[PDB]
Design an enzyme around this catalytic site. Sequence first.
Site, PDB file in Angstrom:
ATOM      1  N   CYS A  60      74.708  63.970  63.562  1.00  0.00           N
ATOM      2  CA  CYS A  60      73.244  64.093  63.515  1.00  0.00           C
ATOM      3  C   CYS A  60      72.794  64.995  64.655  1.00  0.00           C
ATOM      4  O   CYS A  60      72.437  64.524  65.733  1.00  0.00           O
ATOM      5  CB  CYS A  60      72.573  62.728  63.615  1.00  0.00           C
ATOM      6  SG  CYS A  60      70.733  62.780  63.813  1.00  0.00           S
ATOM      7  N   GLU A 334      55.179  55.037  52.045  1.00  0.00           N
ATOM      8  CA  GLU A 334      55.967  53.856  51.705  1.00  0.00           C
ATOM      9  C   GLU A 334      57.459  54.143  51.739  1.00  0.00           C
ATOM     10  O   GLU A 334      58.248  53.282  52.135  1.00  0.00           O
ATOM     11  CB  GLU A 334      55.549  53.329  50.337  1.00  0.00           C
ATOM     12  CG  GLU A 334      54.070  52.940  50.291  1.00  0.00           C
ATOM     13  CD  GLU A 334      53.574  52.490  48.914  1.00  0.00           C
ATOM     14  OE1 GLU A 334      53.369  53.364  48.043  1.00  0.00           O
ATOM     15  OE2 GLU A 334      53.378  51.269  48.714  1.00  0.00           O
TER      16      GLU A 334
HETATM   17  C1  LIG Z   1      56.137  49.196  49.268  1.00  0.00           C
HETATM   18  C2  LIG Z   1      56.571  48.559  50.547  1.00  0.00           C
HETATM   19  C3  LIG Z   1      57.759  49.342  51.143  1.00  0.00           C
HETATM   20  C4  LIG Z   1      55.420  48.473  51.549  1.00  0.00           C
HETATM   21  C5  LIG Z   1      53.975  48.304  51.095  1.00  0.00           C
HETATM   22  N1  LIG Z   1      53.297  49.592  51.115  1.00  0.00           N
HETATM   23  C6  LIG Z   1      53.269  47.241  51.967  1.00  0.00           C
HETATM   24  O1  LIG Z   1      52.142  47.418  52.444  1.00  0.00           O
HETATM   25  O2  LIG Z   1      53.818  46.165  52.232  1.00  0.00           O
END
Ligand SMILES: CC(C)C[C@H](N)C(=O)O
Length: 363
Positions: A60, A334
């Site tokens: 890395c 996400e």
């Molecule tokens: C989809 C998951 C990784 C996280 C989601 N966005 C949450 O607020 O918990």
Amino acid sequence: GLEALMSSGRVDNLAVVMGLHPDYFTSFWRLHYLLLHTDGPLASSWRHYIAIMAAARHQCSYLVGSHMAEFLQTGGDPEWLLGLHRAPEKLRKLSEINKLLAHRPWLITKEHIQALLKTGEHTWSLAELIQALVLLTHCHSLSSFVFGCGILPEPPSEQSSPRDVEALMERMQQLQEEEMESRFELEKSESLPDMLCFVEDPTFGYEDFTRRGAQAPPTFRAQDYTWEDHGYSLIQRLYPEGGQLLDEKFQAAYSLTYNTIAMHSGVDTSVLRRAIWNYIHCVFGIRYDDYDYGEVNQLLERNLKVYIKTVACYPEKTTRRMYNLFWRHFRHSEKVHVNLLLLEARMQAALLYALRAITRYMT
Ligand SMILES: CC(C)C[C@H](N)C(=O)O
């Protein structure tokens, strides 16, 4: 998001991407500044060099090239940048545990701890060792993150930029309402250049090619040695300032939620985030006694398991196609949230094995 700092040009690409989750960034930054810019058991130059040894396990160069520059600015005999062989033997004794922590943590053994603490001309103290284990595991988990988020050297990312979701939300509701051992073994057995002179045995990884059949770490019953009531308390005894910061960072990531899924809000996602966590610990052999490992396949689409496991075990092999291929209707934020759920779960497993070997040596 920490938008003004990200778009400022004054922090590097890795921290720019961490900015996307301010509640995690604060915990990540505190441990980063502690390990690298705070007086502790080990000299600054040693800490940057230990970080090079760790990032080299995953080839890395983002992290290798950055700690090289820091190692030079902070003092740091330049000749050590010619290879491990030019470093003090006290640092060289770290290669074995470095490699094992990065690739097969479950093989760490009190006999490994005995070698490091063996009385000689330059012995590791426990506070020095504990800081070195935190640095090694910190930089392994940071290599997972660098590769999994496609972070470019000094856009900040090659992969992230400035329907079946409802199937998944249905499966999560159904859940929010022995042969357990069998379903865990099934999930665990499923199968999916200039840096070289800072490592030994460069082709050691997850997956033994010396043995037919895919990699299956030995099942370790969690609760025999947990962070909550074994590992944390050992780190705060031997390295107080880091134990609390690690605990806060572990909790920061395990509980981070915006109550959203893709385009939906008002959702409780803990059953899904627990599956990401409990799967990665399963890839490293840790079985939670009261968890139905069937929930992993109910909740983690196959393209998400290939990515999670590649980023936890072979981050070098992560690709833009692999990043795009899973959770196609989810937000980039996400995908990043998944990456830091998995570096925290990977780091906690490697630490716990190391911490368990230390306890066994003390006895
Ligand atoms: C989809 C998951 C990784 C996280 C989601 N966005 C949450 O607020 O918990």
